[PDB]
Each structure stands twice: as structure tokens, then as C-alpha cells.
Amino acid sequence: PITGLVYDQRMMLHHNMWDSHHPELPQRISRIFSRHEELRLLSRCHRIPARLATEEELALCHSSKHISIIKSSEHMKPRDLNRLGDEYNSIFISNESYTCALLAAGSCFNSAQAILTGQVRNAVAIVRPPGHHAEKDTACGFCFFNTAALTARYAQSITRESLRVLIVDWDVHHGNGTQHIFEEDDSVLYISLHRYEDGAFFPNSEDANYDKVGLGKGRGYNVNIPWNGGKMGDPEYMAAFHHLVMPIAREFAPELVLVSAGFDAARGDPLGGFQVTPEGYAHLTHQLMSLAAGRVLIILEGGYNLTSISESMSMCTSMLLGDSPPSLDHLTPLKTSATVSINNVLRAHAPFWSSLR
Ligand SMILES: O=C(NO)c1ccc(Cn2nnnc2-c2cccs2)cc1
Ligand SMILES: [K+]
Numbered sequence: 001p002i003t004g005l006v007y008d009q010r011m012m013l014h015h016n017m018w019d020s021h022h023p024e025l026p027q028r029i030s031r032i033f034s035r036h037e038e039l040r041l042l043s044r045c046h047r048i049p050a051r052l053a054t055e056e057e058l059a060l061c062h063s064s065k066h067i068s069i070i071k072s073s074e075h076m077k078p079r080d081l082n083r084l085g086d087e088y089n090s091i092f093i094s095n096e097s098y099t100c101a102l103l104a105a106g107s108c109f110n111s112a113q114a115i116l117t118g119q120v121r122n123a124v125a126i127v128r129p130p131g132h133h134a135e136k137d138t139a140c141g142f143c144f145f146n147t148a149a150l151t152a153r154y155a156q157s158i159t160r161e162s163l164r165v166l167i168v169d170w171d172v173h174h175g176n177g178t179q180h181i182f183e184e185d186d187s188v189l190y191i192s193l194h195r196y197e198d199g200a201f202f203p204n205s206e207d208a209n210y211d212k213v214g215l216g217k218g219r220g221y222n223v224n225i226p227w228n229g230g231k232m233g234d235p236e237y238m239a240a241f242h243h244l245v246m247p248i249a250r251e252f253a254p255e256l257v258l259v260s261a262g263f264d265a266a267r268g269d270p271l272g273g274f275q276v277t278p279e280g281y282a283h284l285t286h287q288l289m290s291l292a293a294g295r296v297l298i299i300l301e302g303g304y305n306l307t308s309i310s311e312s313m314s315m316c317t318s319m320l321l322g323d324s325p326p327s328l329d330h331l332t333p334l335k336t337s338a339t340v341s342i343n344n345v346l347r348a349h350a351p352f353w354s355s356l357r
């Protein structure tokens with residue numbers, strides 16, 4: 001296919017001024033981008049310009065209060081930045097954080113626009129800070145604004161409010177914010193795979209369990225695939241895609257696919273403890289390309305091992321460009337708790353999705 005790419009070095013300015021070893025490093029996006037040059041993927045992509053989201057566009061999903069408080073950080077002394085971030089769960093703030101969050105969202109809006117107007121079929125967004133933990137009313141988990149959810153609402157806003165958007169969240173953490181923003185919405189299908197461990201894994205809410213299926217009109221349009229019992233990898237993700245993600249996505253018949261593409265389920269990630277390989281990621285991308293006549297935007301969320309994320313996101317771009325997926329030969333048998341996880345999601349969603357029955 002013809003594949004868009006958006007990257008802006010300005011998104012590197014957002015930094016932890018008290019702890020420069022904090023995993024959500026500026027060089028996350030510079031290394032992913034560099035590795036795209038090194039693999040010469042960049043020359044095969046249509047460069048989409050970055051841009052600031054407007055406060056009007058942020059309001060697609062966030063309150064005035066929340067937009068206003070994060071905007072006020074631009075002009076704070078360090079001791080005020082420190083104390084503002086302590087108001088949230090796992091948030092650091094610098095004078096540049098607002099601008100960077102704006103850049104992450106605008107980059108994704110331009111990418112959605114390039115896709116939906118037919119300038120490209122598919123696109124990768126190399127952006128930070130991440131979005132999926134951000135709520136309507138609060139920052140959380142290194143996230144200021146819900147980039148993915150905003151892009152889903154911005155896409156509906158420049159096309160039609162009916163546009164069926166599938167958000168696949170394969171970041172190792174639950175997109176608490178993405179689930180809540182669309183919980184009562186049957187126009188946005190939210191599928192998250194995430195390490196859960198009975199509430200022990202961040203963000204530590206029962207909201208990420210398989211029995212949270214959506215509310216009212218949204219009942220069945222929220223699919224949590226929670227992993228328990230530690231390490232997971234290619235076999236579990238390939239099994240989850242086959243029995244759940246792809247059957248539900250096919251029934252839903254999305255007109256656009258957003259991937260909340262965290263690479264913290266990657267082998268080597270210090271915060272995920274999982275073993276998804278770049279080849280694994282290449283297979284999940286290729287499978288998603290089978291939907292929405294290939295209309296797929298891949299948006300960076302988390303992922304904290306600089307090699308793993310650079311190798312993993314490059315393999316995804318490579319797939320969007322139409323390259324042949326690496327053999328995933330000799331996959332081991334599934335972990336048991338992963339069979340149980342998949343079967344718990346089937347029992348929860350069979351009532352809503354004939355393709356699972
Ligand atoms: O966005 C995230 N992943 O993609 C994310 C968000 C928040 C957390 C919180 N946490 N939990 N345990 N250690 C931590 C750390 C806090 C600061 C450095 S480590 C982990 C991960
Ligand atoms: K997830």
C-alpha cells in the first residue's frame with residue numbers, strides 16, 4: 001500500500017526534570033524514527049506534517065477544566081510543575097508537555113485525515129507523550145490527552161458521526177481512558193489486550209476485566225482480553241487475534257482501525273514482562289490490514305526498551321507498506337491462564353457476537 005508517516009522532533013521536549021532515567025524518554029520517538037531511516041522505510045512512506053491540535057479538538061473528548069489545567073503548566077516554576085504532577089497518578093510535567101501532547105494529537109488528526117480523504121491507505125504516528133490512560137477529566141500514566149480517542153472523534157467529525165472505528169489497544173496496559181470515553185458508544189469498538197493479574201498490573205482497576213462489555217447502547221462494544229499468570233508472547237497474542245479480535249472486528253465491519261500501539265508487551269520491556277517479538281507485531285499488523293479495506297493508523301502509546309520499540313514499530317510500518325510477514329514458525333502451545341482468559345472473553349461476548357458462537 002501507500003503508507004503515511006508522521007514524526008516531529010519537537011515531541012522530544014517533554015521531559016522529567018527531576019528524574020531523567022524515567023522510562024518515558026524523549027529518545028523513544030527519535031530512536032523509532034532513526035531505525036525507520038536505518039531500514040530505509042522512511043523513503044517508502046509519505047511524510048505527513050505534524051501540527052498542534054486546537055483546544056476545540058481536545059474538547060472532542062476532554063473537559064474545559066482538564067484542558068485549562070494542563071494548558072496552565074506551560075508557565076509554571078518547577079516546584080509548581082512538581083506539585084501539579086503529584087495531583088495525578090504517574091504524571092511528570094515540564095513547560096513543553098502541553099505543546100507535545102498537542103503535537104501528538106494533531107499529528108494523529110493529520111494522519112486520520114490523509115487516510116480518510118484517500119491521500120494514503122494507512123499510516124504510522126511516532127508520537128509522545130502517550131494517550132490511552134488519559135481520561136475526559138484527568139491525566140494518568142504518562143498521558144495528558146487521549147490521542148487515540150481524540151483521533152476516533154476527529155475522524156467521525158471530518159466524515160460522519162456514524163463512522164465505525166475499531167481501536168485495537170495492544171499496549172501491555174489497559175487503556176482505562178479509551179474504554180471510559182467510548183463505554184456507552186456503539187460507533188467505536190474498543191478491543192484491549194493487557195496484562196491484568198487480577199488488578200495487580202497498572203492501572204490496577206477491575207474496569208480492565210473481561211466482564212466489562214460496555215454500557216447501554218455500547219453493551220458489547222468494549223472487549224477487554226486480560227492476561228493473568230505472568231509472561232505472555234506471540235502464541236497468546238496470535239490465539240487472541242484468531243478466536244476474538246479478528247472474528248469481532250469482521251462482524252463490526254469498521255471503516256477505520258486505530259491501533260493504540262504500545263510496544264511494552266515486547267521482549268525486553270522493563271515494565272511489561274512479556275515476550276511479543278517484532279515478527280509477532282508484524283503478524284498482528286498484517287491481520288488488521290485485512291479490515292476497513294486496509295485503513296489502519298498505528299499510534300505509538302508506551303514501550304520503554306529503545307531497541308524493542310524501534311525494531312517492533314519498524315516491523316509494523318514494513319507490513320503497512322505491503323511487505324511479506326516473517327514466518328512465525330513453530331509457535332509453542334498457549335499458557336493455560338491465557339486459554340482461560342480467551343474463554344472468559346468468549347463467555348462474556350458470545351451474547352453479543354454470533355461469530356464467537
Ligand atoms: O504508560 C505506561 N506504560 O505504557 C505506564 C504508566 C504508569 C506506570 C506506573 N508504574 N507502575 N509501576 N511502575 C511504574 C512506574 C512509574 C514511573 C516509572 S515506572 C507504568 C506504566
Ligand atoms: K492494552
Ligand SMILES: [K+]
Binds near residue numbers: 186188190221
Ligand atoms: K465502545
Ligand SMILES: [Zn+2]
Binds near residue numbers: 172262264301303
Ligand atoms: Zn503501557
